[PDB]
Every structure is written in structure tokens, then in C-alpha cells.
Design a protein around this ligand. Structure first.
Ligand SMILES: Nc1ncnc2c1ncn2[C@@H]1O[C@H](COP(=O)(O)OP(=O)(O)O)[C@@H](O)[C@H]1O
Ligand SMILES: [Mg+2]
Ligand code: NA
Ligand SMILES: [Zn+2]
Length: 230
């Protein structure tokens, strides 16, 4: 079977991973995706300890989790096996690389043997379906491949789906690039994630978002999620 599952299932069930990097253009949903992945990992294996670290020069994790984080790791309230860390420079470390274009200088020696080992390290690209993000995602992947960092999954986030005149017009754009991505990323897990009815904040909402990272979102059947955030 040549059609890869459009999910992060292969990554979250990849028991040997030590590093899960998350990268992409500013605003595409790296805080959201990296936090949701970390929440899923923590929930699935409650006896193992997970760290979510962000290099974003922002209180991104703090605002997403509604809890104060910093340079020292601190456990997430309600998920005692997940810690978060915000540092402007564990079974698995999930690593939001914001700003990705700069952090890709930092990821540059026994750590390197870890990074270039596909059994220990993967890099999830996040993008939105518009020209700049797509083309910068292509560029980022080419660069990661040249440094032998594994990439097998790409999240396309903030999608509107079939069917509001503005939304119809915007979906016309989105699907044009989505169709292009389908072809570009045939050898990849290409996860289609919908735009929700509000920002994604708090552990409960992050958990809900993470559901469709692991099971393919069907806009005809699953659209309650858009309005299901509290
Ligand atoms: N699928 C989505 N639906 C609704 N809001 C989203 C979605 N993805 C991200 N967001 C929101 O969009 C904003 C940017 O997302 P964020 O994950 O912080 O991007 P990044 O970390 O890539 O800069 C945040 O305020 C976040 O709550
Ligand atoms: Mg930024
Ligand atoms: Na390669
Ligand atoms: Zn609309």
C-alpha cells in the first residue's frame, strides 16, 4: 500500500523516538500542533515523562496551556507526566522550533548522531495552505534532508473545507495548494487539520484538537469539533 495514512499515528506510536521537532512558518500552528502532540504522548503513556520545549521568543506555551512556564521545566496542571519549558536560546522531547528559520541554525556532536537517526528523531513540518508557507515548507524540507534529519509527516492546518462567500473564496485558494501538496507529499503522511471556531487554549481543548491529528478529519461528519471548544 502506497497511500500513507494522513495522520501522526506513525510518529506517536513510534516507541523509540527521543526527539520530535516541530517547525514551519510563523503563525501556522506550531504551538498548537506541538502542544497537542505532547498532550497525546503524555496521555497514551502515563508512566513515562515528556517534555515540551519551545524556543519561540514569546510566552506561547504559557498562553496555550493557561499556565506560567519558563527556562526551568514545570509540570502541566492535570498532566503530571508532561513538563513544559520556554527557553530563548524524558522519554521523548517535543520541540517547537519557532522561529524555525533561525532555530535551523541551532540544531546544527553526539547529539547530531541522535538527530540523524530516524529511529530517534523526526521533524514534523506545519504549514497553512497558501503560497509563502507552502514554498517555505518545501525549502525547509530540502534543507532538513541535506542534513539527514528525517521528515515523514506534514500538518496542513487551518483548513476551511468544501463550502459564506469569503470562506468559499478562501477554500478555493486552500484546495489549489492542498491539491499541489497531495502530489508533492505522496511519500509523506499529510495531515489535513481544520480551522476551529476559536483559538485553541487549555489542556482540554488541546486534547480535542489532537484527536484529528491521529484520525483523519471528515468535514461532513466531524465538524462538531469546530464549535466544541470550551
Ligand atoms: N486549526 C486551528 N483552528 C483555530 N485556531 C487555531 C488553529 N491553529 C492555530 N490556531 C490559533 O492561531 C494562532 C496561531 O497559532 P499558533 O499555534 O500559535 O502558531 P505558531 O506557533 O505556528 O506561530 C493561535 O492564536 C492559535 O490558537
Ligand atoms: Mg515568530
Ligand atoms: Na536525507
Ligand atoms: Zn465564513
Amino acid at each position: 500500500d502506497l497511500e500513507l495514512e494522513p495522520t501522526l499515528e506513525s510518529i506517536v506510536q513510534h516507541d523509540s523516538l527521543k526527539w520530535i521537532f516541530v517547525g514551519g512558518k510563523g503563525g501556522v500552528g506550531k504551538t498548537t500542533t506541538s502542544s497537542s502532540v505532547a498532550v497525546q504522548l503524555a496521555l497514551a503513556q502515563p508512566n513515562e515523562q515528556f517534555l515540551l520545549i519551545s524556543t519561540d521568543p514569546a510566552h506561547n506555551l504559557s498562553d496555550a496551556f493557561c499556565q506560567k512556564f519558563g527556562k526551568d521545566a514545570r509540570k502541566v496542571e492535570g498532566l503530571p507526566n508532561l513538563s513544559c519549558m520556554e527557553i530563548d536560546p524524558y522519554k521523548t522531547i517535543i520541540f517547537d522550533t519557532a522561529p524555525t528559520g533561525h532555530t535551523l541554525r541551532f540544531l546544527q556532536s553526539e547529539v547530531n548522531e541522535q538527530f540523524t537517526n530516524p529511529e530517534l528523531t523526526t521533524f514534523i513540518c506545519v504549514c497553512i495552505s497558501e503560497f509563502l508557507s507552502l514554498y517555505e515548507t518545501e525549502r525547509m524540507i530540502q534543507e532538513l534532508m541535506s542534513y539527514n534529519m528525517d521528515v515523514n509527516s506534514i500538518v496542513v492546518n487551518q483548513l476551511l473545507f468544501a463550502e459564506c462567500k469569503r470562506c468559499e473564496s478562501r477554500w478555493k485558494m486552500q484546495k489549489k495548494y492542498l491539491d499541489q501538496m497531495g502530489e508533492l507529499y505522496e511519500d509523506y503522511h499529510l495531515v489535513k487539520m481544520p480551522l476551529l471556531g476559536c483559538e485553541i487554549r487549555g489542556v482540554e481543548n488541546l486534547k480535542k484538537f489532537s484527536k484529528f491529528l491521529l484520525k483523519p478529519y471528515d468535514p461532513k461528519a466531524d465538524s462538531d469539533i469546530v464549535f466544541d471548544l470550551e
